[PDB]
């Protein structure tokens, strides 16, 4: 689950992935299943939302116990695994997962073309407030991050439910494809360690054990300011139960039409699978990845 | 009596075994709707189990004070088959009964409707705070020891359980605020609907109580539709009045509708 | 009642995070001030031990006054006479109880919960520490009581035969105490749309009396009890609040 420890337990059920891509929670008719798992455990709706601090001795104690009787039934028997646990002395426990959440949720927020570099400085300055953070003497910098990491993935769960009701969702012979335009918060979107954040969350969503197809997805999110449009290929994967490593295309191919017509990209990152474009040059760009199909 | 342990075994397949259009027995599947909102309140209908059984109908009309305590206890068992751990949290289901006609609008309430369930429609006037009730009387006897097993007050009655030879003799007994369960209280008033007077007489009042789950689903000026039963409250029935034997009647509440 | 004060007593003494520890330097700095009183942070206590907290959630009337006497002990380890039973204040952060939903389960629960105050009233004073004497045998006693469940919960008894209650309360030698009676309506935010905004009444003791002006936006933490006075029904009682610590906003 997602930050048991600094959380309640329902809070952790909803904005998980292994229990959204089992229970599909997005919808309503998935809603109803979760509450039906507490009553088979026997924990109440009052208790279950309390922080996981304040909970009774003899439901943490038991823990272990009721997560093997009654969580066969729903499918989810891959939540069981083995993790690390650093506790200093008197402060109290934070696992190994639960702490790279707290670094990927620093290396965003809590901080014409002279509005762009203006902006890479708010992130070159903002590796710094991660580098100290990552030590054992200041903890005030730490829970200055986990209260930054539960509004990065409220806001991520309620986009990404109102994509699947209006199914926005190209279903092309080739791959998939998603062209977000207009929402809330929008502004969030510039860092791409947030796209790949809810594009994470849109591939083991669709892409599940239900067989569909295997297909890539392409997203493409905008703001104002010269309409930027980040566009970013994804991969796809395989639920958990990998004999397929190459698993990736879009440097090659991608990168022979921007040697075609050149039309206003820069190929500005570490990474060979994420652009930027112009709103103008959108529409005649995309037709060109349909043909000369290399997967 | 003890022909009781028949009724539970013959009233339980009316909870799994009873089934209508084509399937999806409406009482299997009422118990996954508790649970998933967690409410301690099973809903049943009159007509659903008058047309399979007329024995435990007229047992309903005779006397539902000792009728809904059997029907209450093996209610718990039925869901308890598919969600065995359940007794933690409330460990009582108490019951909804449907509709049943037998007074028109407030005013035929004479002795051959006592201690019977009875259907009646009104308006709300007025309504007191919320407030806890005892539910569990455990005395403070100074002989034997401040725990003393639990007992039962649980009425409009308040029980005159005098301690007597407790521990050696009769110790002393108070009340005190440990360990007991409490319940909510609501008393609602409600007088008859200005659409069926009949031509010149005043609307009459009458008190309901409400108990436990049922707390603030009035809002004063709604059309309610009470299916309570109609008893005989003591303590303090007109306590200037001894040459008048004149008992107080309140309708103590087992469910609620809205207009329809 | 026995050994859960050196259960206690361990904690105070010995709990320490990474270089200065606190409850042996909160304690010390609130006796040369003369303030008598000491804040727990309730989320030490269940990183230090598990089983005591325990305790405290499920029966805090007879627990908390036990640990008012776990801190009057380790007072006389710092000052070397009159040194009277402490306070104690604490504050913590789980979740908000909102104040239309207090069912009967909560009786005797730490709460915390929000709202505005209305109105203040009066001091007062309530007993702590009494002499009795007898009025024909003359036998002198002491009563003190510690422990707050608003009436009577601890009173006279009826023989040191002699009458009826033949004790006399002599008000030459006691100690006392301020009660402030306060209440509190909920926040107009959580919107009664067919109802009117309810209200509850609490206590406080001796060193939160006189803090909140009427009109701020509070937090109070404390122990939701009930009590039995007539002052319109059978067996009826009536709920309030014994605040233990309010944590008010900055005043502005």
Same mark, same amino acid.
């Given at each position: 689950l ?8 329902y ?18 008719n ?6 039906k798992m507490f009553?088979?455990?026997?924990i ?11 909970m009774?001795?003899?439901?943490k ?10 969580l066969?039934?729903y499918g989810?028997?891959?939540?069981i695994?083995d993790?690390f646990?650093?506790?200093?002395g ?6 190994a ?6 670094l ?15 902006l ?5 300055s ?6 100290d953070?990552?030590?054992d ?15 990065l993935?409220?806001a991520?769960?309620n986009?990404g439910?109102?994509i ?15 062209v977000?335009?207009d ?6 979107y510039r ?21 569909k ?18 566009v ?10 990998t ?8 440097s090659?191919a991608?990168?022979?039409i921007?040697?075609?017509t050149?039309?206003?990209?820069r190929?500005d990152?570490?990474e ?19 043909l000369?199909?290399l997967? | 009596?003890?022909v ?11 909870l ?14 009422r ?6 909102? =967690? ?12 047309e399979s ?5 007229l047992?309903?009309?005779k006397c539902?004070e000792?009728?809904?305590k ?17 007794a933690r ?21 004479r ?9 009646v429609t009104?308006?709300v006037?007025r ?15 100074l ?8 007992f ?23 009340? =005190?605020?440990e360990?007991?369960?409490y319940?909510?209280?609501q ?6 609907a200005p ?6 007489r005043?609307?009459?009042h009458?008190?309901v109580?409400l ?7 009035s ?5 309610v ?5 109609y008893?005989n409250?003591?303590?303090?029935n ?5 040459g008048?034997?004149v ?7 087992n469910?609620i509708?809205?207009?329809? | ?30 006796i ?7 804040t ?10 598990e ?10 009337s ?5 640990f008012?006497?776990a801190?009057? #002990?380790?007072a006389?380890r710092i ?16 979740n ?9 389960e ?21 007993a702590?520490?009494?002499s ?15 422990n707050f ?10 023989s040191c ?6 004790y ?5 030698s006691?100690?006392?105490?301020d #009660?402030?009676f306060?209440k ?8 009664p749309?067919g ?15 006189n803090?909140?002006?009427?009109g ?5 933490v404390?122990?939701y009890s ?6 319109s ?11 233990l610590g309010?944590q ?5």
């Open positions: 997602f930050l048991l420890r600094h959380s309640s337990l809070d952790s059920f909803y904005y998980s992935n292994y229990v959204n891509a089992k229970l599909s929670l997005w919808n309503e998935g809603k109803k299943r979760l509450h009553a088979r455990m026997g109440p709706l009052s208790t279950a939302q309390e922080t996981w601090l304040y009774d001795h003899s439901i104690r038991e823990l272990g116990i009721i997560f093997d009787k009654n066969d039934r989810l028997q891959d939540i695994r993790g646990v650093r506790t200093l008197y402060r109290g426990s934070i696992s997962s639960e702490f790279v959440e707290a990927t949720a620093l290396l965003e927020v809590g901080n014409s073309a002279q509005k762009l570099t203006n890479r400085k708010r992130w070159v903002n590796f710094w407030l991660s580098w953070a990552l030590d003497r200041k903890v005030e910098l730490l829970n200055r991050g986990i209260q930054l990491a539960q509004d993935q409220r991520i769960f986009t439910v109102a699947l009701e209006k199914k926005l969702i190209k279903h092309l012979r080739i791959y998939r494809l998603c977000l335009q929402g809330p918060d929008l502004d969030l860092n791409p360690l947030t796209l790949l954040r809810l594009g994470n969350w849109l591939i083991e969503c669709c892409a599940e054990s239900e067989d197809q295997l297909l890539p997805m392409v997203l493409a999110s905008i703001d104002e300011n010269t309409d930027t449009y980040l970013a290929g994804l991969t796809p994967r395989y639920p958990r139960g004999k397929k490593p190459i698993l990736n295309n879009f090659m991608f990168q022979q921007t040697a075609e050149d039309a206003k990209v190929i990152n570490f060979s699978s994420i652009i930027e474009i112009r709103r103008e040059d959108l529409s005649p760009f995309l037709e060109k990845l349909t000369s199909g997967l | 009596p003890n009781s342990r028949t009724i539970a075994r013959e009233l339980k397949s009316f799994l075994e009873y089934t209508d259009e084509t399937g999806r027995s409406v009482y299997g599947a118990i996954r709707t508790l649970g998933e909102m =967690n409410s301690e309140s099973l809903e049943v209908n009159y007509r659903h189990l008058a059984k007329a024995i435990l109908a047992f309903l009309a539902p000792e009728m809904l059997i029907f209450d206890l093996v209610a718990m068992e039925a869901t308890e088959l598919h969600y065995p751990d359940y949290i409330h460990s009582e289901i108490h019951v909804r009964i449907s509709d049943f006609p037998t007074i028109y609008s407030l005013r035929e309430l002795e051959s409707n006592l201690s019977s369930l009875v259907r009104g308006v006037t309504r007191t705070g919320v407030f806890p009730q005892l539910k569990y009387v455990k005395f403070n006897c002989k034997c020891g401040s725990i003393l097993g639990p039962f007050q649980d009425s409009n009655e308040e029980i005159r359980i005098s301690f007597c030879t407790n521990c050696k003799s009769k110790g002393p007994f108070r009340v =005190n605020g360990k007991t369960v319940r909510n209280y008393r609602v008033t409600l007088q008859e659409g069926t007077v009949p031509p010149g005043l609307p009459r009458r008190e109580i108990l436990a789950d049922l707390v603030d689903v809002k004063p000026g709604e059309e539709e009470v299916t309570g039963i008893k409250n003591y303590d303090g007109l306590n200037a009045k001894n008048f034997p008992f107080a009647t309140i309708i103590e509440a469910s509708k809205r207009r329809e | 009642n026995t050994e859960i004060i050196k259960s206690f007593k361990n904690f105070i003494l010995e709990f320490r995070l990474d270089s200065q520890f606190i409850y042996r330097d909160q304690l010390r700095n609130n040369l001030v003369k303030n008598y009183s000491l727990v942070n309730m989320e030490h206590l269940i990183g230090y031990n089983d005591i907290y325990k305790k405290l959630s499920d029966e805090p007879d627990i908390i006054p036990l008012e006497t801190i009057t #002990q380790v006389k000052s070397i006479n009159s040194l009277p039973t402490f306070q104690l204040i604490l504050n913590s952060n789980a908000q109880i909102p104040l239309r939903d207090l069912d009967s909560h009786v005797s629960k730490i709460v915390r919960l929000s709202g505005i105050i209305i109105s203040t009233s009066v001091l007062s004073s309530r702590t520490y009494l009795i004497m007898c009025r024909n045998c003359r036998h002198t006693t002491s009563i003190t009581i510690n469940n608003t009436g009577n919960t601890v009173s006279l008894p009826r035969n002699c009458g009826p209650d033949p006399i309360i002599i008000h030459e006691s100690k006392f105490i #009660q402030q306060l509190l309506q909920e926040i107009p935010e959580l919107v749309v109802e009117m905004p309810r209200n509850l009444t609490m206590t406080c003791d001796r060193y939160l009396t803090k909140v002006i009427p701020t936006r509070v937090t109070i404390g122990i009930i009590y039995n006075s007539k002052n029904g059978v067996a009826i009682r009536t709920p309030y609040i014994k605040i309010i008010s906003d900055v005043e502005t």
